Design a protein around this motif. Structure first.
Motif, PDB file in Angstrom:
ATOM      1  N   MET A   1     -33.490  39.866 -21.962  1.00  0.00           N
ATOM      2  CA  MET A   1     -33.469  38.500 -21.268  1.00  0.00           C
ATOM      3  C   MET A   1     -35.145  38.167 -21.089  1.00  0.00           C
ATOM      4  SD  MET A   1     -32.182  36.229 -19.282  1.00  0.00           S
ATOM      5  CE  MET A   1     -30.644  36.560 -18.779  1.00  0.00           C
ATOM      6  N   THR A   2     -35.429  37.189 -21.834  1.00  0.00           N
ATOM      7  CA  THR A   2     -36.734  36.510 -21.857  1.00  0.00           C
ATOM      8  C   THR A   2     -37.732  37.612 -22.584  1.00  0.00           C
ATOM      9  OG1 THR A   2     -37.495  37.263 -19.727  1.00  0.00           O
ATOM     10  CG2 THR A   2     -36.529  35.357 -19.640  1.00  0.00           C
ATOM     11  N   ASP A   3     -38.112  38.585 -21.792  1.00  0.00           N
ATOM     12  CA  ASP A   3     -39.266  39.442 -22.334  1.00  0.00           C
ATOM     13  C   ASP A   3     -38.628  40.898 -22.432  1.00  0.00           C
ATOM     14  OD1 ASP A   3     -41.559  40.034 -23.123  1.00  0.00           O
ATOM     15  OD2 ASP A   3     -42.625  39.718 -21.399  1.00  0.00           O
ATOM     16  N   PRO A   4     -38.484  41.492 -23.620  1.00  0.00           N
ATOM     17  CA  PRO A   4     -38.256  42.935 -23.658  1.00  0.00           C
ATOM     18  C   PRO A   4     -39.277  43.864 -23.652  1.00  0.00           C
ATOM     19  CG  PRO A   4     -38.120  41.903 -25.868  1.00  0.00           C
ATOM     20  CD  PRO A   4     -38.548  40.724 -24.872  1.00  0.00           C
ATOM     21  N   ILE A   5     -40.626  43.300 -24.085  1.00  0.00           N
ATOM     22  CA  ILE A   5     -41.793  44.373 -24.019  1.00  0.00           C
ATOM     23  C   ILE A   5     -42.136  44.544 -22.674  1.00  0.00           C
ATOM     24  CG2 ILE A   5     -44.021  44.520 -24.541  1.00  0.00           C
ATOM     25  CD1 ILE A   5     -42.140  42.093 -26.657  1.00  0.00           C
ATOM     26  N   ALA A   6     -41.954  43.576 -21.690  1.00  0.00           N
ATOM     27  CA  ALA A   6     -42.096  43.752 -20.227  1.00  0.00           C
ATOM     28  C   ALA A   6     -41.312  44.858 -19.591  1.00  0.00           C
ATOM     29  CB  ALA A   6     -42.185  42.270 -19.458  1.00  0.00           C
ATOM     30  N   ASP A   7     -40.082  44.656 -20.153  1.00  0.00           N
ATOM     31  CA  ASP A   7     -39.118  45.689 -19.806  1.00  0.00           C
ATOM     32  C   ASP A   7     -39.594  47.087 -20.325  1.00  0.00           C
ATOM     33  OD1 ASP A   7     -36.586  46.653 -18.657  1.00  0.00           O
ATOM     34  OD2 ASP A   7     -35.520  45.131 -19.316  1.00  0.00           O
ATOM     35  N   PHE A   8     -39.975  47.358 -21.369  1.00  0.00           N
ATOM     36  CA  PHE A   8     -40.334  48.563 -22.046  1.00  0.00           C
ATOM     37  C   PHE A   8     -41.532  49.037 -20.830  1.00  0.00           C
ATOM     38  CE2 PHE A   8     -42.678  50.805 -25.478  1.00  0.00           C
ATOM     39  CZ  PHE A   8     -41.748  52.009 -25.538  1.00  0.00           C
ATOM     40  N   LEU A   9     -42.665  48.179 -20.735  1.00  0.00           N
ATOM     41  CA  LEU A   9     -43.594  48.794 -19.814  1.00  0.00           C
ATOM     42  C   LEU A   9     -43.073  49.027 -18.419  1.00  0.00           C
ATOM     43  CD1 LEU A   9     -46.348  46.303 -20.800  1.00  0.00           C
ATOM     44  CD2 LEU A   9     -45.597  48.348 -22.068  1.00  0.00           C
ATOM     45  N   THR A  10     -42.242  48.277 -18.058  1.00  0.00           N
ATOM     46  CA  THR A  10     -41.699  48.597 -16.622  1.00  0.00           C
ATOM     47  C   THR A  10     -40.781  49.947 -16.593  1.00  0.00           C
ATOM     48  OG1 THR A  10     -41.691  46.166 -15.884  1.00  0.00           O
ATOM     49  CG2 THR A  10     -40.019  47.597 -14.627  1.00  0.00           C
ATOM     50  N   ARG A  11     -39.966  50.219 -17.686  1.00  0.00           N
ATOM     51  CA  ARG A  11     -39.255  51.354 -17.751  1.00  0.00           C
ATOM     52  C   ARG A  11     -40.259  52.610 -17.803  1.00  0.00           C
ATOM     53  NH1 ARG A  11     -33.892  50.747 -19.489  1.00  0.00           N
ATOM     54  NH2 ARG A  11     -33.311  48.659 -19.941  1.00  0.00           N
ATOM     55  N   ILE A  12     -41.325  52.544 -18.771  1.00  0.00           N
ATOM     56  CA  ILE A  12     -42.196  53.555 -18.480  1.00  0.00           C
ATOM     57  C   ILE A  12     -42.966  53.861 -17.141  1.00  0.00           C
ATOM     58  CG2 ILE A  12     -44.372  54.645 -19.303  1.00  0.00           C
ATOM     59  CD1 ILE A  12     -42.182  52.718 -21.753  1.00  0.00           C
ATOM     60  N   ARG A  13     -43.102  52.650 -16.408  1.00  0.00           N
ATOM     61  CA  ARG A  13     -44.047  52.684 -15.271  1.00  0.00           C
ATOM     62  C   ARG A  13     -42.994  53.303 -14.379  1.00  0.00           C
ATOM     63  NH1 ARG A  13     -44.236  47.740 -14.349  1.00  0.00           N
ATOM     64  NH2 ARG A  13     -45.920  47.507 -15.866  1.00  0.00           N
ATOM     65  N   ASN A  14     -41.670  53.037 -13.958  1.00  0.00           N
ATOM     66  CA  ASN A  14     -40.840  53.447 -13.222  1.00  0.00           C
ATOM     67  C   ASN A  14     -40.659  54.857 -13.385  1.00  0.00           C
ATOM     68  OD1 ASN A  14     -38.945  50.489 -13.155  1.00  0.00           O
ATOM     69  ND2 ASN A  14     -40.742  50.981 -12.289  1.00  0.00           N
ATOM     70  N   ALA A  15     -40.287  55.299 -14.606  1.00  0.00           N
ATOM     71  CA  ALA A  15     -40.139  56.912 -15.033  1.00  0.00           C
ATOM     72  C   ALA A  15     -41.431  57.553 -14.582  1.00  0.00           C
ATOM     73  CB  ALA A  15     -39.646  57.040 -16.348  1.00  0.00           C
ATOM     74  N   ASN A  16     -42.473  56.915 -14.832  1.00  0.00           N
ATOM     75  CA  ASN A  16     -43.757  57.832 -14.653  1.00  0.00           C
ATOM     76  C   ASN A  16     -44.038  58.000 -12.911  1.00  0.00           C
ATOM     77  OD1 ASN A  16     -46.295  58.882 -14.703  1.00  0.00           O
ATOM     78  ND2 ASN A  16     -47.241  57.030 -15.482  1.00  0.00           N
ATOM     79  N   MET A  17     -43.608  56.866 -12.101  1.00  0.00           N
ATOM     80  CA  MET A  17     -43.662  57.086 -10.748  1.00  0.00           C
ATOM     81  C   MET A  17     -42.591  57.877 -10.205  1.00  0.00           C
ATOM     82  SD  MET A  17     -43.458  53.944  -8.043  1.00  0.00           S
ATOM     83  CE  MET A  17     -44.760  53.248  -8.298  1.00  0.00           C
TER      84      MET A  17
END
Ligand SMILES: [Mg+2]
Ligand SMILES: [Mg+2]
Ligand SMILES: [Mg+2]
Ligand SMILES: [Mg+2]
Ligand SMILES: [Mg+2]
Ligand SMILES: [Mg+2]
Ligand SMILES: [Mg+2]
Ligand SMILES: [Mg+2]
Ligand SMILES: [Mg+2]
Ligand SMILES: [Mg+2]
Ligand SMILES: [Mg+2]
Ligand SMILES: [Mg+2]
Ligand SMILES: [Mg+2]
Ligand SMILES: [Mg+2]
Ligand SMILES: [Mg+2]
Ligand SMILES: [Mg+2]
Ligand SMILES: [Mg+2]
Ligand SMILES: [Mg+2]
Ligand SMILES: [Mg+2]
Ligand SMILES: [Mg+2]
Ligand SMILES: [Mg+2]
Ligand SMILES: [Mg+2]
Ligand SMILES: [Mg+2]
Ligand SMILES: [Mg+2]
Ligand SMILES: [Mg+2]
Ligand SMILES: [Mg+2]
Ligand SMILES: [Mg+2]
Ligand SMILES: [Mg+2]
Ligand SMILES: [Mg+2]
Ligand SMILES: [Mg+2]
Ligand SMILES: [Mg+2]
Ligand SMILES: [Mg+2]
Ligand SMILES: [Mg+2]
Ligand SMILES: [Mg+2]
Ligand SMILES: [Mg+2]
Ligand SMILES: [Mg+2]
Ligand SMILES: [Mg+2]
Ligand SMILES: [Mg+2]
Ligand SMILES: [Mg+2]
Ligand SMILES: [Mg+2]
Ligand SMILES: [Mg+2]
Ligand SMILES: [Mg+2]
Ligand SMILES: [Mg+2]
Ligand SMILES: [Mg+2]
Ligand SMILES: [Mg+2]
Ligand SMILES: [Mg+2]
Ligand SMILES: [Mg+2]
Ligand SMILES: [Mg+2]
Ligand SMILES: [Mg+2]
Ligand SMILES: [Mg+2]
Ligand SMILES: [Mg+2]
Ligand SMILES: [Mg+2]
Ligand SMILES: [Mg+2]
Ligand SMILES: [Mg+2]
Ligand SMILES: [Mg+2]
Ligand SMILES: [Mg+2]
Ligand SMILES: [Mg+2]
Ligand SMILES: [Mg+2]
Ligand SMILES: [Mg+2]
Ligand SMILES: [Mg+2]
Ligand SMILES: [Mg+2]
Ligand SMILES: [Mg+2]
Ligand SMILES: [Mg+2]
Ligand SMILES: [Mg+2]
Ligand SMILES: [Mg+2]
Ligand SMILES: [Mg+2]
Ligand SMILES: [Mg+2]
Ligand SMILES: [Mg+2]
Ligand SMILES: [Mg+2]
Ligand SMILES: [Mg+2]
Ligand SMILES: [Mg+2]
Ligand SMILES: [Mg+2]
Ligand SMILES: [Mg+2]
Ligand SMILES: [Mg+2]
Ligand SMILES: [Mg+2]
Ligand SMILES: [Mg+2]
Ligand SMILES: [Mg+2]
Ligand SMILES: [Mg+2]
Ligand SMILES: [Mg+2]
Ligand SMILES: [Mg+2]
Ligand SMILES: [Mg+2]
Ligand SMILES: [Mg+2]
Ligand SMILES: [Mg+2]
Ligand SMILES: [Mg+2]
Ligand SMILES: [Mg+2]
Ligand SMILES: [Mg+2]
Ligand SMILES: [Mg+2]
Ligand SMILES: [Mg+2]
Ligand SMILES: [Mg+2]
Ligand SMILES: [Mg+2]
Ligand SMILES: [Mg+2]
Ligand SMILES: [Mg+2]
Ligand SMILES: [Mg+2]
Ligand SMILES: [Mg+2]
Ligand SMILES: [Mg+2]
Ligand SMILES: [Mg+2]
Ligand SMILES: [Mg+2]
Ligand SMILES: [Mg+2]
Ligand SMILES: [Mg+2]
Ligand SMILES: [Mg+2]
Ligand SMILES: [Mg+2]
Ligand SMILES: [Mg+2]
Ligand SMILES: [Mg+2]
Ligand SMILES: [Mg+2]
Ligand SMILES: [Mg+2]
Ligand SMILES: [Mg+2]
Lengths: 130, 134
Positions: free
Chosen positions: A1-17
């Motif tokens: 949906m719209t932006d997959p790279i933003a989804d990538f970054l959000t996935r790493i951010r959530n897993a990191n938190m």
RNA sequence: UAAGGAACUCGGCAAAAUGACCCCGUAACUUCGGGAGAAGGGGUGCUCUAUUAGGGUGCAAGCCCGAGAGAGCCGCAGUGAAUAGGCCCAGGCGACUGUUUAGCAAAAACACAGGUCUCUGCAAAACCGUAAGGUGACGUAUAGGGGCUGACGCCUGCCCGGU
RNA sequence: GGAGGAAAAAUUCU
RNA sequence: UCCCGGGCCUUGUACACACCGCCCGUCACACCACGAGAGUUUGUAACACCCGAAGUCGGUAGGGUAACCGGAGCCAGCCGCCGAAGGUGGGACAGAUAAUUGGGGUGAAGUCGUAACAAGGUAGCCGUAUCGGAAGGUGCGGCUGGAUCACCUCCU
RNA sequence: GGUGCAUUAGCUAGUUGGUAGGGUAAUGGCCUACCAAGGCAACGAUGCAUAGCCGACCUGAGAGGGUGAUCGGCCACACUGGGACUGAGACACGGCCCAGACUCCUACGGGAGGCAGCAGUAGGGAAUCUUCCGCAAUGGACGAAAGUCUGACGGAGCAACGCCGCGUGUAUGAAGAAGGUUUUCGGAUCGUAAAGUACUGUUGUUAGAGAAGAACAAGGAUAAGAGUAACUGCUUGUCCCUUGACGGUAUCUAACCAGAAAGCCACGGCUAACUACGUGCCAGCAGCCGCGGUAAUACGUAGGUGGCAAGCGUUGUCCGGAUUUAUUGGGCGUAAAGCGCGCGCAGGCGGUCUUUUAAGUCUGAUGUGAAAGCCCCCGGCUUAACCGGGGAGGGUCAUUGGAAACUGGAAGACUGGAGUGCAGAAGAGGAGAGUGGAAUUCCACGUGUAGCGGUGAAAUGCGUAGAUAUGUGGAGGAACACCAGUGGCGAAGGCGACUCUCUGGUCUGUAACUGACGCUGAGGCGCGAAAGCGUGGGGAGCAAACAGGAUUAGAUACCCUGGUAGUCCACGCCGUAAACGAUGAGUGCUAAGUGUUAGGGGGUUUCCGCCCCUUAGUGCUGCAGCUAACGCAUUAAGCACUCCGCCUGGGGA
């Protein structure tokens, strides 16, 4: 949906938190390029490409320092579908005063800030990570 | 808002009105019209004088004046200093500055620039109130 | 009919003025139909292009219909005579068309479509007649008779002691 | 503790 | 269980001077700004007709005229199109002013009530209709941004 | 490429294009005749309002915001409006013709004029300068030259209007001259500040020497060239002579002199700097917090102190602080801020892979972005202001060569998104017709007699003409007890009796099928509780308005007795709500525990049942995270992206 790279970054951010150790998501060429870059600068520990007959997936292991210190402390998206950002060779930014890195897609592929400023080429900046 | 919402209609500021409108325009007799010219001081003709009472909690009487400016504006000004030599049909020089004590007064009177006189027995702050060195 | 132009008069009464065809243009208000021919303007004669451009008619011969343009010509004046709206602003009354005192009053009066109240179950009520016999009606409560109001818009308050 | 349904009593003033 | 006074816990609050609190609206007085108003007045930009100077252009030129070969050519004069200003007409827009009028705002002790804040003493609020000196009342539908909640049912 | 209004939506007709012609230096409806009805506009046409444009100036960390003073470049105008001639060039500031307003002369026939040129006058203003010198320098017009003209220009005068620079003295001089201010009346303070002492003249006075800006042009000799039969002359080079408004100006040299030269604002906090007297909510101060009613660091004065300095204060305008329009750089549960909801045109955005294109993107070279200005480095004025040289900066700029990761285009390929197929499931989803029972009201008839109803107490009211009560029958209308449950369906409003007919949507199961067919969506179209409106019916209960009885000081109310519209039905309007989860739609990621609705798979089990796993809804408790807090927390108010709507102090509203 719209932006997959933003989804990538959000996935790493959530897993990191959450202090997660392993992450998996569907794969592509640009995703593999970003993962390889992050592995080269050592932000992540390892990345694998698992073959499934839809598109393939990539699995990254988050890396943490001694005494549970987060190696990755932040990811920000610069270029967006609603507003694209292009940077010249003399306009490439230094992330976190040289402590972090930036990803830029130029005519010679995907590179970091150091590579882009070494070859005096420009492209579009994708994200900052520090 | 999103970038598309911003390109469709851009941002707008807020128009801030002034505090001393009567100093911001002049009069043309040939066209009998009003023009936008801003001035630091103006001159006018007195119509009546008196002393009104302030709002709570103050009660001391204050010296004011009513003036027709160069553009025929009914302007209520304040008389500073101790004592004055003002009366009806006198030429006065009105200057910017409002006082909070009086709900309607918005302008001051320069002392010593026109028919208006200075203040007697003034040693401090002598540049204002129009008193020369003794 | 000189000059003036309602100064006349209860009141512009009477008279004067506009008036035909073609073109331009046209307000407030409105029940969206109107107002409206609003208001205000311009052009009309004769000759040559010219048995026109073109149409109707007929097998053709021929015969009728005739707009625009140009050049000109003549008078004070060209729908050259007769016949042929004067217009505008504002208020009262009545919605409108219609009717009325033959022979003094044409109206703001009557009527009107609409509203409401009330009576009537059919041999209906109501009306004419002593009665028979009729109208109502060859109808049947979405029908028939009587009282009041009078398009349309917004509404129609309180009193059942007296009659 | 939270949500739903649900009775009986009732003078005026400061 | 009830009547009266206390003590502790809890709950609601627009109060803190602390309910002898806070606070709403009309009426009377003064002032200020704005809208409406039968009218009057000033200006702006156009439009449609009438008339139309100077001037360029076009047409004639009987009157005048040395250069060219009496003729040509030229000019005065006259006519035509366009044409500024002016005149007439109906509209458009903008400002000022006007008997009176409508709500609004401010004003140390005016008059009338107490609508809201506690369950404010009839819970409050929103839409709508009607009524009343005024705050407001009542009917219909909705909300909890509601105090109490005997008895009954689910959840943590 | 650089402005405000949509409370300014249509504008235009030589307009739009063509065929021929005329005209101009040139193309062109620039103009004419003919032919067709075009053209511009929500990417804002047309209209109204304001405004000369730029290099640049002020501010700001920057992005941006405000302005167009001086100087340089372009444009328009010359009292208002129109026109043409001469000329290479004008529709021409100090040229011409006509009309218009004004000023002036006239013998009444008629004539003359245009400071928004340099000075200067009147008027308007809060506010702006001499009716000066010279062509010496630079540049213009004329001429072969001398030379003439040049209010251009080079200079002088006025105004603290601004920037820069200098001075009103310097060293020493005491338990501390004298005298003010206070005093706890011993003292402190002005204060090394004074007098005294030693020194200088930057300024100033007096008397004198006194530049650059000057290159020349022309005139006389020369030397060399081209041209010529020869000259004269011409071009270049070298010499001789001459030229100053500023101006006896800058500058310099000597003598005298501490003498002739300091003011303004402020002192409670913001903000640097306090004591006394006088006054007493008066006089007054004030940007705000606010001070003044008898002990005032805030009012006036005196002493002292602080800031600046020939300046200091006040006012007006702009930028900052203001993240207070937030691209850089804000938000929408309760503070302002999510349309009541849906269907959808334009627009914005868009799953995976391959080949190809270079529109976007990145980069090299060429030309250009005047001078002056900011900035950097050098210099010249005794320094500075100022001036000079070189350099740098500034563009979504034109020509052109490159790369192809990403966005875009074309040609293909694939299912995760989306939809269809096949098998099941549940439901008060919607419209139409018919039917059922309980209860209320009214009517008729048996039995029966004095009350019934109502309230905190009463009363109005019904009743001996016979109620209330009880039994039987008939008429009619509205609503659907138990089931019933933070259960179900719908986009929202909303939907509860039963049966049938016609219809919409959803969930799970499969992987058969197509292959990005998707999301959002300004303007449009439609739905939308209740109240209300129009027409025609129906009317049992309830009940706005209304009447009566009570309460109360009054009671246009709450309470009691009645009661009309309305509530009901059909068709047509209206278009609102605390239309609320006070929370826009789409997608993905991120601990758990426990109920419930509709399904699917497995294990225990002969079934039943119990256990585990999973999809889609609906409740509660809680971690990280977020919040001003309350609180939210896989049904986010957490972490991210796409699109829309909305907010910018309260009242007026
Ligand atoms: Mg002072
Ligand atoms: Mg006559
Ligand atoms: Mg006559
Ligand atoms: Mg008359
Ligand atoms: Mg008479
Ligand atoms: Mg008369
Ligand atoms: Mg008559
Ligand atoms: Mg008329
Ligand atoms: Mg004639
Ligand atoms: Mg009539
Ligand atoms: Mg008669
Ligand atoms: Mg008659
Ligand atoms: Mg009979
Ligand atoms: Mg009969
Ligand atoms: Mg009548
Ligand atoms: Mg009546
Ligand atoms: Mg009666
Ligand atoms: Mg009676
Ligand atoms: Mg409860
Ligand atoms: Mg107690
Ligand atoms: Mg105890
Ligand atoms: Mg207690
Ligand atoms: Mg409490
Ligand atoms: Mg009532
Ligand atoms: Mg609701
Ligand atoms: Mg610019
Ligand atoms: Mg500008
Ligand atoms: Mg041509
Ligand atoms: Mg202007
Ligand atoms: Mg400057
Ligand atoms: Mg700033
Ligand atoms: Mg400027
Ligand atoms: Mg100027
Ligand atoms: Mg200039
Ligand atoms: Mg001029
Ligand atoms: Mg003038
Ligand atoms: Mg010529
Ligand atoms: Mg000239
Ligand atoms: Mg002149
Ligand atoms: Mg001048
Ligand atoms: Mg003067
Ligand atoms: Mg000269
Ligand atoms: Mg010269
Ligand atoms: Mg001269
Ligand atoms: Mg000059
Ligand atoms: Mg000069
Ligand atoms: Mg000056
Ligand atoms: Mg100065
Ligand atoms: Mg100085
Ligand atoms: Mg001195
Ligand atoms: Mg001395
Ligand atoms: Mg000394
Ligand atoms: Mg003393
Ligand atoms: Mg000294
Ligand atoms: Mg001397
Ligand atoms: Mg001398
Ligand atoms: Mg001298
Ligand atoms: Mg020579
Ligand atoms: Mg020579
Ligand atoms: Mg020499
Ligand atoms: Mg010589
Ligand atoms: Mg000589
Ligand atoms: Mg000379
Ligand atoms: Mg001289
Ligand atoms: Mg001299
Ligand atoms: Mg000198
Ligand atoms: Mg001497
Ligand atoms: Mg001496
Ligand atoms: Mg001296
Ligand atoms: Mg000396
Ligand atoms: Mg001295
Ligand atoms: Mg001095
Ligand atoms: Mg003081
Ligand atoms: Mg002092
Ligand atoms: Mg001082
Ligand atoms: Mg800002
Ligand atoms: Mg933002
Ligand atoms: Mg904010
Ligand atoms: Mg939001
Ligand atoms: Mg709010
Ligand atoms: Mg909503
Ligand atoms: Mg809302
Ligand atoms: Mg919606
Ligand atoms: Mg679209
Ligand atoms: Mg893509
Ligand atoms: Mg430059
Ligand atoms: Mg310059
Ligand atoms: Mg130097
Ligand atoms: Mg400089
Ligand atoms: Mg320079
Ligand atoms: Mg330079
Ligand atoms: Mg630079
Ligand atoms: Mg490719
Ligand atoms: Mg699917
Ligand atoms: Mg009975
Ligand atoms: Mg296939
Ligand atoms: Mg819409
Ligand atoms: Mg209704
Ligand atoms: Mg109805
Ligand atoms: Mg009642
Ligand atoms: Mg609303
Ligand atoms: Mg809402
Ligand atoms: Mg969302
Ligand atoms: Mg769930
Ligand atoms: Mg919770
Ligand atoms: Mg929040």
């Amino acid at each position: 949906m719209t932006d997959p790279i933003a989804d990538f970054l959000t996935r790493i951010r959530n897993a990191n938190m959450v202090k997660h150790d392993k992450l998996e998501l569907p794969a592509s060429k640009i995703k593999k390029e970003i993962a390889e870059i992050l592995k080269r600068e050592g932000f992540i520990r390892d990345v694998e490409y698992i073959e499934d007959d839809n598109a393939g997936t990539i699995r990254v292991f988050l890396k943490y320092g001694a005494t549970g210190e987060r190696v990755i402390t932040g990811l920000k998206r610069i270029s967006k579908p609603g507003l694209r950002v292009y940077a010249k060779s003399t306009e490439v930014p230094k992330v976190l005063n040289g402590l972090g890195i930036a990803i830029v897609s130029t005519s010679q592929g995907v590179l970091t800030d150091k590579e882009a400023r070494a070859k005096q080429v420009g492209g579009e900046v994708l994200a900052y990570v520090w | 808002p999103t970038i598309n919402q911003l390109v469709r209609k851009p941002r707008q500021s807020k128009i801030k009105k002034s505090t001393s409108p009567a100093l911001n325009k002049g009069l043309n007799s040939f066209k009998r019209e009003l023009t936008d010219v801003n001035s630091p001081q103006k001159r006018g003709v007195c119509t009546r004088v008196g002393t009104m009472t302030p709002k709570k909690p103050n009660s001391a009487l204050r010296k004011y004046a009513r003036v027709r400016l160069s553009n025929g504006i009914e302007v209520t000004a304040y008389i500073p200093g101790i004592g004055h030599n003002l009366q009806e049909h006198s030429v006065v020089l009105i200057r910017g500055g409002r006082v909070k004590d009086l709900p309607g007064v918005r302008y001051h009177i320069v002392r010593g620039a026109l028919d208006t006189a200075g203040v007697e027995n003034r040693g401090q702050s002598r540049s204002k109130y129009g008193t020369k060195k003794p």
